[PDB]
Amino acid sequence: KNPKSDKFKVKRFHHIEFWCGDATNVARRFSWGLGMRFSAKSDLSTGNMVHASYLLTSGDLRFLFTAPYSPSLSAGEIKPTTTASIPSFDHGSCRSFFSSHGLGVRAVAIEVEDAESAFSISVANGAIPSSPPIVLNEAVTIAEVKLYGDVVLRYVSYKAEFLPGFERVEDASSFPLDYGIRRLDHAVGNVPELGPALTYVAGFTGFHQFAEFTESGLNSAVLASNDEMVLLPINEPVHGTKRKSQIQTYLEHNEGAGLQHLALMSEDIFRTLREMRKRSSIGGFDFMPSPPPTYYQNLKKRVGDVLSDDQIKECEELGILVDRDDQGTLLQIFTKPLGDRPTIFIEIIQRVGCMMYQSGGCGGFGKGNFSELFKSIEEYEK
Amino acid sequence: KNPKSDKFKVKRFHHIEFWCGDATNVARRFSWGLGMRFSAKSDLSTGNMVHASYLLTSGDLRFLFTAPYSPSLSAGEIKPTTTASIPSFDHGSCRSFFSSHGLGVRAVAIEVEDAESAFSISVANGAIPSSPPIVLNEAVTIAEVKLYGDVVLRYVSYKAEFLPGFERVEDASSFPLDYGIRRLDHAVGNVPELGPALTYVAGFTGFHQFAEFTESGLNSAVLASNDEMVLLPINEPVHGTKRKSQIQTYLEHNEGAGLQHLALMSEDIFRTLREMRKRSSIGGFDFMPSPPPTYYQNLKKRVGDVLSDDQIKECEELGILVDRDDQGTLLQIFTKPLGDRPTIFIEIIQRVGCMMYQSGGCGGFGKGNFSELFKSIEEYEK
Numbered sequence: 001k002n003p004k005s006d007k008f009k010v011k012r013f014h015h016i017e018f019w020c021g022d023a024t025n026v027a028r029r030f031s032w033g034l035g036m037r038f039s040a041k042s043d044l045s046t047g048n049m050v051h052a053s054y055l056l057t058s059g060d061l062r063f064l065f066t067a068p069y070s071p072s073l074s075a076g077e078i079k080p081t082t083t084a085s086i087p088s089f090d091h092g093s094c095r096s097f098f099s100s101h102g103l104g105v106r107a108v109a110i111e112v113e114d115a116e117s118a119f120s121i122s123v124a125n126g127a128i129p130s131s132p133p134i135v136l137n138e139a140v141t142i143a144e145v146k147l148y149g150d151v152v153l154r155y156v157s158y159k160a161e162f163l164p165g166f167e168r169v170e171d172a173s174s175f176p177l178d179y180g181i182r183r184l185d186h187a188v189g190n191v192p193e194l195g196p197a198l199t200y201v202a203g204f205t206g207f208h209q210f211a212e213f214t215e216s217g218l219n220s221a222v223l224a225s226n227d228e229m230v231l232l233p234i235n236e237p238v239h240g241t242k243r244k245s246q247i248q249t250y251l252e253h254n255e256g257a258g259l260q261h262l263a264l265m266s267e268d269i270f271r272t273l274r275e276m277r278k279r280s281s282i283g284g285f286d287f288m289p290s291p292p293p294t295y296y297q298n299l300k301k302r303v304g305d306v307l308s309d310d311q312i313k314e315c316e317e318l319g320i321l322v323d324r325d326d327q328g329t330l331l332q333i334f335t336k337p338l339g340d341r342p343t344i345f346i347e348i349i350q351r352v353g354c355m356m357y358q359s360g361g362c363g364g365f366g367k368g369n370f371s372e373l374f375k376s377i378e379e380y381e382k
Numbered sequence: 383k384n385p386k387s388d389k390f391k392v393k394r395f396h397h398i399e400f401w402c403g404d405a406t407n408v409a410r411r412f413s414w415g416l417g418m419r420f421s422a423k424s425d426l427s428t429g430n431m432v433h434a435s436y437l438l439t440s441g442d443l444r445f446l447f448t449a450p451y452s453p454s455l456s457a458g459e460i461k462p463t464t465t466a467s468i469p470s471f472d473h474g475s476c477r478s479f480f481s482s483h484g485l486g487v488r489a490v491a492i493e494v495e496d497a498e499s500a501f502s503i504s505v506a507n508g509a510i511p512s513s514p515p516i517v518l519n520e521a522v523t524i525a526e527v528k529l530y531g532d533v534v535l536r537y538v539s540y541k542a543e544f545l546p547g548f549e550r551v552e553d554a555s556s557f558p559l560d561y562g563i564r565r566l567d568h569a570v571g572n573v574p575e576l577g578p579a580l581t582y583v584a585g586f587t588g589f590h591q592f593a594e595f596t597e598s599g600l601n602s603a604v605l606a607s608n609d610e611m612v613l614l615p616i617n618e619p620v621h622g623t624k625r626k627s628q629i630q631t632y633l634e635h636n637e638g639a640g641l642q643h644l645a646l647m648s649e650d651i652f653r654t655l656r657e658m659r660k661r662s663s664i665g666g667f668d669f670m671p672s673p674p675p676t677y678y679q680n681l682k683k684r685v686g687d688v689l690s691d692d693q694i695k696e697c698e699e700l701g702i703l704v705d706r707d708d709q710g711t712l713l714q715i716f717t718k719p720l721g722d723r724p725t726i727f728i729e730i731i732q733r734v735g736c737m738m739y740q741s742g743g744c745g746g747f748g749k750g751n752f753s754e755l756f757k758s759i760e761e762y763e764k
């Protein structure tokens with residue numbers, strides 16, 4: 001059941017912002033590893049004396065990488081006179097975030113009808129303000145509230161081309177990489193306690209529970225906007241298990257709550273994973289270990305309806321996971337952590353079914369793969 | 383004249399250590415961009431709870447990228463019980479370095495006969511101690527003194543395979559990239575005052591002046607070991623010029639003195655630059671703007687002895703600079719800055735001449751290219 005209870009008009013995921021120590025090196029690694037184009041910049045060359053910000057795009061997916069310059073470059077500025085293109089940026093907050101968490105997502109940004117209204121309604125409904133609404137060049141409004149840990153939910157609204165003060169990247173520097181990724185499907189937080197986290201976020205957004213999960217080491221639940229295109233799962237650890245909770249491992253290495261993974265939808269997950277796997281050892285991203293061939297021997301018994309044995313053969317080569325709802329089927333795979341710490345990682349997914357356009361969350365989030373991978377591992381020892 | 387006055391036995395450049403916020407992303411970017419192999423690691427997976435360190439190699443060139451983990455992972459350790467593999471590492475020093483300078487070189491490491499003797503003699507001769515000699519697994523001794531700014535000169539000596547506690551990288555993760563780079567040729571510091579800097583470094587090493595330079599915006603001089611294989615140039619700015627000194631720009635954006643560039647010798651600079659230029663826009667390194675065709679039209683008049691017109695044609699395609707000594711010829715090119723700030727960059731070089739092996743510094747360091755590039759620019763306006 002979908003009570004359609006959003007307290008303000010939400011459209012789509014807009015962008016994800018990473019706070020880095022060096023935005024250049026992270027952005028170039030991600031660009032090559034994920035096949036994203038360099039599409040906009042705000043930095044010294046555009047007159048920004050405060051922060052360096054580089055935008056990568058693939059389809060509708062927008063990854064922003066930001067790092068501070070020396071505060072000495074902008075010591076004479078005040079907020080009214082700032083050369084920053086993102087007004088919520090703060091040297092001290094950014095350095096504190098990165099020193100505490102390492103490389104990670106600072107902002108999950110959603111496009112709304114009216115960012116000032118969204119901020120006002122959010123705060124009136126319990127949200128903790130982070131950055132008040134600010135109008136950029138009478139064209140875009142941006143506002144931020146706290147989501148979990150040091151991650152903020154960022155509202156962006158446009159009157160009528162990322163942000164004012166960002167310049168389009170010249171095509172000689174913008175190589176048209178594309179491995180098939182097209183949009184952000186969901187963004188998942190890890191927190192120490194799920195109940196209070198859900199009550200807080202659902203409280204100021206009005207997002208409704210879409211799904212929920214629960215020996216796997218976690219409990220989780222998914223918050224969703226009215227049309228269920230903005231999906232915000234949250235995990236908490238389950239203590240006492242023989243194998244230690246990876247949610248707890250995350251919290252320890254991340255120094256508390258934060259964004260656990262970003263799921264990126266591909267229009268052709270086989271092409272995406274072929275392209276990403278070719279680059280894993282030459283600057284790209286590594287993938288989690290493949291499931292045993294038992295898992296794929298069982299796959300015919302569960303999705304032989306949807307995938308040909310040739311297409312299942314291809315899943316086995318690429319190490320792709322498959323799960324199935326009563327409503328749709330999900331193809332998914334997980335990278336190893338994106339940086340030094342065993343914290344944030346990326347999920348590549350593709351959904352089949354729920355045609356009306358495709359409805360959000362078609363096929364779920366892969367809950368069934370906990371059991372079937374444990375079963376497949378038991379069957380391999382044989 | 384070479385007074386051969388080293389106060390201790392110096393062998394060769396051993397490695398360069400970068401202090402990063404995320405070693406993973408910088409190391410993968412550098413590996414792809416420069417064609418270096420992932421060859422050793424010390425991190426969580428090897429039991430290091432303190433820092434993540436990844437070693438890249440090409441020929442004899444060794445680039446080390448290190449970042450701190452959360453201090454909470456190692457809060458119960460003390461120096462006698464540390465899981466760090468580099469004993470000079472300190473969470474606070476590393477975070478302070480990176481927050482102040484951004485991505486940069488922390489250590490210029492040279493292999494010596496006896497690192498404890500080298501440290502003792504250095505300090506007895508005015509060096510500022512940074513990390514006392516420490517014996518690792520009765521196999522390697524490491525010690526550090528201050529060089530300039532927050533950069534240290536690191537001594538390493540081996541009794542009889544990077545460092546103890548580092549593990550060789552498994553070949554499945556170690557892709558054998560190689561674009562022709564073979565060793566570090568020289569490493570250059572920028573300081574506010576050259577005299578005191580030279581007096582300090584030459585004082586504790588006994589390195590002798592190899593060369594010196596001086597409207598270009600700087601004054602410089604080169605310190606060299608007995609056989610002139612360890613070359614340590616130092617630059618200071620020249621104020622008042624119409625165009626602002628890039629040495630001064632460095633000092634402002636770096637928050638003081640530091641390492642300006644690393645010159646990497648290639649066994650085939652044409653292959654190296656073809657390979658690096660192919661990757662500039664897909665995660666690698668960008669190069670400084672090419673000199674005008676006038677520069678190459680003049681090149682026949684100065685090195686037509688050494689390079690065929692076909693080989694000069696190839697320099698023009700790749701944007702390679704050429705300078706010439708009375709003793710040898712130098713091919714060189716410069717990258718754009720390696721990170722967000724206009725601070726550290728890389729030079730690719732190849733030397734021809736001075737065959738005995740090749741003697742160090744053959745062809746100089748390119749001083750003649752200041753005039754000839756200014757001349758070539760004047761001739762292009764035509």
Ligand SMILES: CCCCCn1ccc2c(C(=O)Nc3nnnn3C)ccnc21
Nearest residue numbers: 186188220233347365366367369370373
């Ligand atoms: C034993 C590992 C085998 C794969 C099990 N496995 C299945 C899904 C999944 C997610 C994930 O994608 N979780 C999510 N995404 N949105 N909501 N949630 C809760 C993250 C980490 N391991 C996962």
Ligand SMILES: CCCCCn1ccc2c(C(=O)Nc3nnnn3C)ccnc21
Nearest residue numbers: 568570602615729747748749751752755
């Ligand atoms: C106007 C720019 C045209 C190139 C002029 N140009 C010639 C050499 C050079 C170095 C360099 O390599 N300097 C060095 N290396 N070792 N010692 N020194 C002093 C660094 C930056 N621009 C340089």
Ligand SMILES: [Co+2]
Nearest residue numbers: 188263347365
């Ligand atoms: Co997921």
Ligand SMILES: [Co+2]
Nearest residue numbers: 570645729747
């Ligand atoms: Co040089």
